[PDB]
């Protein structure tokens, strides 16, 4: 999720998404969900489930 | 080139922003859309990188990676090792003299 | 209420009371409104409703 | 030796370029006599203005008269208009509440207090917002602390209605109720909520 | 000045083009104006202003609705400037010019009818002269963060 | 939390959940079955499977914010089109339903 | 309830509202539930009923 | 006639500012009057020379483009063989039938 | 049919009409020929016997 960096004023991607926005990245597969903020930076695929 | 600091100037020689423009033009029709570049940390390198980036936006693309090294340095092995693990063999090194030799 | 063979089921919508109408320029307007409000407040209308 | 230098209490230091870390910026406006005033002062990290609300300056010597901005009076009661406290973090008024301001009074001879900002939401506020969108007029909503809905005491109206009586507020949205004596002084609009006098017993 | 030789010890007491931006942003936030626009001419330093305003408005959560970031740069009377200026419909306008261009733009806007009782230009420092050469075009009620000369 | 902050009307009812959220997915479930919490909002699949398996709790309510899942990518990688086509083919081939069955 | 005249695109009234508007009557004291199309040009009064 | 036949229509028109360039293009009131036209349909009515002058002035004010539909009466589009340069390509002007009949 | 489309898909691929709003179902061949966007209504194949 988006969050403000401690002892600062900027914001960065924490959690599992931060790894995707870093060297590890590649082909993250997990019970992810589609949202506007998530789709703004990275791009998803066709859904493989509905919930 | 900055009119703010040199409000009284003119010349009949292209700057190296034109060099970056020609870089883009020559790369454009060659199927080499994996551009990465090496920039010296000074005013010239910043201007070259900005010109290349603003020219690349006219194609809805982006540079694969961007790297910088301290001007007049002597140990650049780490930076080069950081540039190896990628799939872009199109290096656009734009250093200055002795930095280029190193 | 009178011929209680039918029913008054259902809720009520578009709530808007009745009124006394007259042209845009008429010298009776404010006085008529004042008299209606005064009767309504002092309870003459309730007697008519009961009757 | 100049990046982290302090002297004589008023700490001032430089960083990287010639940007003084703590500047002394001020704000100026064009007065009606064509001179620069001295509103606000960016001292350390807060703007610290001097005008609570914008004084609505006149554009030119041949501009149209101001006939849209107006003052609206309401008080807090019921689930019609409720006043909350300003959020400490993100010092703005949430997302949907309008910025109403109330006159705050302390105690004793020190009761003279500034116009604190305590913005409010409710049911009548929704109608006010819809009316503002439809008729296209901007307001200066402000709460009232002088009494109650209104009662003619000593041959003078006090509370809400009295303001509208004495040309101090062109509108009195809120939880008023129509009457006979009340309607003689001011002109009401068509009712939008039915009411009366009911009785409740536990 | 913006850039300096890396062998110098010359320092000033003014304020950079980045600090005035946050000053006007605070001014806009305090009075709850929010929606605004960013008409700017072409002048050395305009791209930095636009980028800084974009970054400041992005990395914050107050609900600023910035739209119609105009960059009028071709003449001041032809079709392009007219239509682009007409596109504006906000209640706060934040411009960035250099005196003469600013007075020309303000005159054009008044002729179009954008300087009534419900508009507040917030042009910064650059268009403030020496605070003693006011042209007969600046509308009364024009915010411009500047330096202090009365204070001390 | 992104959904709740997006909806300002829900943001009014956000504080109670804001100051009482947990830090995982199964610890709050253990607390719920330990008679410490009685509420939950998660993905449909996880809660439904948990209710079906643990024959102690049931899911009551109507589905809302029906947003499907999805495999992730970065920026614009060459793998996107082929991966999406393969996922669609698996959906139309009956493979996904069979895998969900097992 | 207002309507259009025969084969002419010009609105005109009828019934009680038409009789009042066409300088024939002067007051319309009867059940005349308040609306918006009516109230555009007839000055209503404060309601004496709520239904 | 336009004002009277627009008040009796069920289609819900959107009557807006009406102008009257009384001056002979003095460039003081005509320009400011013409500048504030935010609509998309204009129903100009003038003489042929005056129409040419007005359209020439309007072309330089960014008021005629891909979506700006002018409508003109018959007395402007007169002898249909002396079309000047200033007339935009595409403008509806009802006239009389001199081709057939 | 005969390597030529017809209908909603036919107009879009022949540079005759941008967008194909309506009741169009994402499939394999269609996505190979004409690219889609994010789905907004869940659907599939369902029998109906009462």
UniProtKB/Swiss-Prot annotation, chains A, G:
Post-translational modification: NMDA is probably regulated by C-terminal phosphorylation of an isoform of GRIN1 by PKC. Its phosphorylated state is influenced by the formation of the NMDAR-PPP2CB complex and the NMDAR channel activity.
Glycan attachment positions: 6
Domain of life: Eukaryota
Localization per record: Cell membrane; Postsynaptic cell membrane; Postsynaptic density membrane; Synaptic cell membrane
Residues reported in the UniProt entry to bind glycine: 31, 33, 38
Assembly and oligomerization: Heterotetramer; the NMDAR subunits are modular and harbor tiered domains that function in concert to regulate opening and closing of the cation-selective ion channel pore. Forms heterotetrameric channels composed of two GluN1/zeta subunits (GRIN1), and two identical GluN2/epsilon subunits (GRIN2A, GRIN2B, GRIN2C or GRIN2D) or GluN3 subunits (GRIN3A or GRIN3B) (in vitro). Can also form heterotetrameric channels that contain at least two GluN1 subunits and at least two different GluN2 subunits (or a combination of one GluN2 and one GluN3 subunits) (in vitro).
Illness: Neurodevelopmental disorder with or without hyperkinetic movements and seizures, autosomal dominant: An autosomal dominant neurodevelopmental disorder characterized by severe intellectual disability and developmental delay, absent speech, muscular hypotonia, dyskinesia, and hyperkinetic movements. Cortical blindness, cerebral atrophy, and seizures are present in some patients.
Protein family membership: Belongs to the glutamate-gated ion channel (TC 1.A.10.1) family. NR1/GRIN1 subfamily.
Name of protein: Glutamate receptor ionotropic, NMDA 1
Organism: Homo sapiens (Human)
Residues of the full protein shown: 486 to 536 of 938
Swiss-Prot record, chain F:
Domain remarks in the Swiss-Prot or TrEMBL record: A hydrophobic region that gives rise to the prediction of a transmembrane span does not cross the membrane, but is part of a discontinuously helical region that dips into the membrane and is probably part of the pore and of the selectivity filter.
Top-level lineage group: Eukaryota
Annotated family: Belongs to the glutamate-gated ion channel (TC 1.A.10.1) family. NR1/GRIN1 subfamily.
Positions annotated to bind glycine: 43
PTM: NMDA is probably regulated by C-terminal phosphorylation of an isoform of GRIN1 by PKC. Its phosphorylated state is influenced by the formation of the NMDAR-PPP2CB complex and the NMDAR channel activity.
Protein name: Glutamate receptor ionotropic, NMDA 1
Species in which this protein is naturally found: Homo sapiens (Human)
Residues in compartment: Extracellular: 1-102
Disease: Neurodevelopmental disorder with or without hyperkinetic movements and seizures, autosomal dominant: An autosomal dominant neurodevelopmental disorder characterized by severe intellectual disability and developmental delay, absent speech, muscular hypotonia, dyskinesia, and hyperkinetic movements. Cortical blindness, cerebral atrophy, and seizures are present in some patients. Neurodevelopmental disorder with or without hyperkinetic movements and seizures, autosomal recessive: An autosomal recessive neurodevelopmental disorder characterized by severe intellectual disability and psychomotor developmental delay, involuntary and stereotypic movements, spasticity, and inability to walk without support. Intractable seizures manifest in some patients.
Glycosylation sites: 82
Subcellular location: Cell membrane; Postsynaptic cell membrane; Postsynaptic density membrane; Synaptic cell membrane
Residues of the whole record sequence present: 690 to 791 of 938
Swiss-Prot record, chain H:
Residues that hold Zn(2+) according to the record: 81, 97
Annotated compartments: Cell projection, Dendritic spine; Cell membrane; Synapse; Postsynaptic cell membrane
Domain of life assignment: Eukaryota
Family assignment from sequence similarity: Belongs to the glutamate-gated ion channel (TC 1.A.10.1) family. NR2A/GRIN2A subfamily.
UniProt comment concerning the protein's domains: Contains an N-terminal domain, a ligand-binding domain and a transmembrane domain. Agonist binding to the extracellular ligand-binding domains triggers channel gating.
Function field: Component of N-methyl-D-aspartate (NMDA) receptors (NMDARs) that function as heterotetrameric, ligand-gated cation channels with high calcium permeability and voltage-dependent block by Mg(2+). NMDARs participate in synaptic plasticity for learning and memory formation by contributing to the slow phase of excitatory postsynaptic current, long-term synaptic potentiation, and learning.
Disease cited in the entry: Epilepsy, focal, with speech disorder and with or without impaired intellectual development: An autosomal dominant, highly variable neurologic disorder. Features range from severe early-onset seizures associated with delayed psychomotor development, persistent speech difficulties, and intellectual disability to a more benign entity characterized by childhood onset of mild or asymptomatic seizures associated with transient speech difficulties followed by remission of seizures in adolescence and normal psychomotor development.
Protein name, as recorded: Glutamate receptor ionotropic, NMDA 2A
Originating organism: Homo sapiens
Organism taxonomic ancestry: Eukaryota, Metazoa, Chordata, Craniata, Vertebrata
Shown residues in whole-protein numbering: 186 to 286 of 1464
